[PDB]
Amino acid sequence: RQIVVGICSMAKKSKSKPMKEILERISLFKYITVVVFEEEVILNEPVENWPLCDCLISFHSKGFPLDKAVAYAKLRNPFVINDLNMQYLIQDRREVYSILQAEGILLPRYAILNRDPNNPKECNLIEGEDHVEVNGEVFQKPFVEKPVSAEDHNVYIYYPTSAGGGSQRLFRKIGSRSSVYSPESNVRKTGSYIYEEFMPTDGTDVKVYTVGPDYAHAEARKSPALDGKVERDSEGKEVRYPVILNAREKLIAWKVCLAFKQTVCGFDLLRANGQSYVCDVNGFSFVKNSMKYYDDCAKILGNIVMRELAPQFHIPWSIPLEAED
Numbered sequence: 001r002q003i004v005v006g007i008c009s010m011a012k013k014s015k016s017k018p019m020k021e022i023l024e025r026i027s028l029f030k031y032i033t034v035v036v037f038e039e040e041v042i043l044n045e046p047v048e049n050w051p052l053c054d055c056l057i058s059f060h061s062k063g064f065p066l067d068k069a070v071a072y073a074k075l076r077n078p079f080v081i082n083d084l085n086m087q088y089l090i091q092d093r094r095e096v097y098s099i100l101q102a103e104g105i106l107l108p109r110y111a112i113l114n115r116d117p118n119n120p121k122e123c124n125l126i127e128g129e130d131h132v133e134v135n136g137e138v139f140q141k142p143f144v145e146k147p148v149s150a151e152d153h154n155v156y157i158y159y160p161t162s163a164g165g166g167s168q169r170l171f172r173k174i175g176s177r178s179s180v181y182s183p184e185s186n187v188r189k190t191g192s193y194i195y196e197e198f199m200p201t202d203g204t205d206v207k208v209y210t211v212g213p214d215y216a217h218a219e220a221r222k223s224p225a226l227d228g229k230v231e232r233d234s235e236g237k238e239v240r241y242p243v244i245l246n247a248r249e250k251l252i253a254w255k256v257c258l259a260f261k262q263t264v265c266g267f268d269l270l271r272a273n274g275q276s277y278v279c280d281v282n283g284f285s286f287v288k289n290s291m292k293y294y295d296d297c298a299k300i301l302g303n304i305v306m307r308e309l310a311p312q313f314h315i316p317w318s319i320p321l322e323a324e325d
């Protein structure tokens, strides 16, 4: 019998072009059958009625019942590609940063401001014109202010007086824009935030996409900290710039993939001051518009499934070679 790979995510993800590109390729594996769980089933059926699988690829996005996925994995005990419980922690930037620190991964100097919504003024924040003090720790402008919820993309950057003051307000892309300037120079007064040092890059962010700990694709985009206008080619796709990871960065990718237990993992790197700093870990994420990524990702995922489960199924399997980039 076939080894069944189950895909469990919201339909927007399960029917996305990159998902479909990868699944058609995984399906080329002789002994693998792919089953995509229907969103209506995920949302409305108890987990006892969900399809069986031997290997589970499942990940959280908006509206996804992560508690049900975890209960399904508990019930059926499949081989899990991206750990489900870690996906609760990935929603909280404080937990992400704590894991990165515990792994010796360079990240911006930071402090957490936890604010009681009942007594918002009592928290340990002192604000000057050109700096803040968070639990006594000083951040000179420019600094970054991130909501503790990793799903809240309202990240603000505060400029020093020497550069005109005010702030850049980033947000989930709305059309041709990913940020805007604001004359406001004072920090937000409601909510809990991570404050961190601004790392000077060349104006680009590096996005890294792992498929297991030994393969990572990287590419760069214009930072929204810049001016907020999204760069587009004549075709209307967002401009992306080529990146090859250095030896240190390839190790970063290995560590992030393993520490978060996300085989398929996206994260952000800031190249600054001759080092590379992780500033965000997003979990499950596919590269778009690269035929070579689709090929490599599907092959790697298929080989992981076979290596783990071929002996159980008495299917003969010799471990092949695999790419890094």
Ligand SMILES: O=P(O)(O)O[C@@H]1[C@@H](OCc2ccccc2)[C@H](OP(=O)(O)O)[C@@H](OP(=O)(O)O)[C@@H](OCc2ccccc2)[C@H]1OP(=O)(O)O
Pocket (backbone or CB within 6 Å): 012, 060, 061, 062, 063, 151, 172
């Ligand atoms: O609801 P918001 O937190 O504000 O943002 C959603 C995106 O969901 C982010 C999210 C929220 C909760 C958990 C994980 C991820 C969601 O991402 P995904 O998790 O579905 O990938 C995003 O879609 P995409 O990544 O495809 O751009 C938007 O969802 C629109 C939406 C749909 C249904 C109800 C509300 C909102 C977007 O909504 P708006 O455009 O109205 O802000």
Ligand SMILES: Nc1ncnc2c1ncn2[C@@H]1O[C@H](COP(=O)(O)OP(=O)(O)NP(=O)(O)O)[C@@H](O)[C@H]1O
Pocket (backbone or CB within 6 Å): 108, 144, 146, 150, 152, 153, 154, 155, 170, 196, 197, 198, 199, 200, 205, 223, 224, 225, 268, 270, 279, 280, 282
């Ligand atoms: N410490 C920093 N120094 C300089 N730039 C930063 C810093 N932190 C964040 N940024 C910039 O601000 C952007 C958004 O911050 P990030 O921590 O990536 O938030 P996000 O909202 O989780 N993004 P994503 O989940 O990738 O959609 C980054 O891509 C960088 O361009």
Ligand SMILES: [Mg+2]
Pocket (backbone or CB within 6 Å): 026, 027, 028, 029, 030, 031, 032, 033
């Ligand atoms: Mg097949």
Ligand SMILES: [Mg+2]
Pocket (backbone or CB within 6 Å): 268, 280
């Ligand atoms: Mg990011």
Ligand SMILES: [Mg+2]
Pocket (backbone or CB within 6 Å): 150, 280, 281, 282
């Ligand atoms: Mg993020």
